[PDB]
Amino acid sequence: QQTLPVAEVAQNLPKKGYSPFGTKQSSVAEWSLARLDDLLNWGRKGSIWPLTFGLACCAVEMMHIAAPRYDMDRYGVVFRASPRQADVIIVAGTLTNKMAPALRKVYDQMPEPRWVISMGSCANGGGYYHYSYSVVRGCDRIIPVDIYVPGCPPTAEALMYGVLQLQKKVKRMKTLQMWYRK
């Protein structure tokens, strides 16, 4: 555990910059691949397209980032009906026994790269229906999850916190530098 720095210490530190991979990497090819990766992650963290999925009550909150108080289209985020035209599936609601192959098929038909936001307590770990017969204990055991939005109804502030943390995860996602070091 570390805390946020004091303003004198914060004035001592320099600016972080946009690039999470640093300014220089002591090679021309490494710098070129890092800047290409920065451009690619800027194009990917800008306008992730979530999927019209909406299993349950947490979905009603999902329209409160559609609703003009929070405005998910300001961030590039915009809903698409088909899973082929989507980067993100927001698994939000109760995942039951009949929806296990449905969610697995919709996730598998969605093309790479794939990031899944788990919104709500039922999608995280079953929640208030954890000890029931029909509810799958979270959506981790069927599909991978990158972001766990924790509130049962999350505030749309807390859902866009998960969306912005997904954007920061895509911003730190590195593939071309990995290709150079593989």
Partner 1 sequence: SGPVMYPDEVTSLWTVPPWNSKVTPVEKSVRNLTLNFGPQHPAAHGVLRLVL
Ligand X SMILES: CCCCCCCCCCCCCCCCCC(=O)OC[C@H](COP(=O)(O)OCCN)OC(=O)CCCCCCCCCCCCCCCCC
* Residues near ligand SF4, by CB under 6 A: 56-58, 93-94, 120-122, 127-128, 152-153
CA distance 158 to 45: 18
- Answer whether 156's CB lies under 8 Å from 164's CB: no
> Binding marks (x or -) toward partner 1, 99..128, rule CB under 8 A?
x--x---x----------------------
The one-character DSSP state at 89 is E
The position carrying tokens 């995942």 is 95
CA distance 103 to 98: 9
Asked whether position 38 contacts ligand X by CB under 6 A, the answer is yes
CB of 41 to ligand X, least distance (A): 9
Q: Which is nearer to partner 1, 56 or 152 (CB)?
A: 56
Which option in partner 1, ligand SF4, ligand X, none does residue 152 bind, with CB closer than 5 to 8 A by kind? ligand SF4
Q: What are the two backbone dihedrals, phi and then psi, of residue 36, each rounded to the nearest 5 degrees?
A: -65, -40
* CA nearest neighbour of 51 among 30, 73, 77: 77
Asked whether position 17 contacts ligand X by CB under 6 A, the answer is yes
Instruction: State the burial class of residue 125 (Cβ atoms within 10 Å of its Cβ: 0-12, 13-18, 19+).
Output: middle
Q: Which is nearer to partner 1, 34 or 92 (CB)?
A: 92
CB of 149 to ligand SF4, least distance (A): 9
- Answer whether 59's CB lies under 8 Å from 93's CB: yes
Token duo for residue 53:
């999925």
* Residues flagged as binding site for [4Fe-4S] cluster: 57-58, 122, 152
* Residues flagged as binding site for NADPH: 182
* Residues flagged as binding site: 57-58, 122, 152, 182
Using CB under 6 A as the criterion, which residues of the chain lie in contact with ligand X when the complex forms?
17-19, 23, 32, 35-36, 38-39, 42
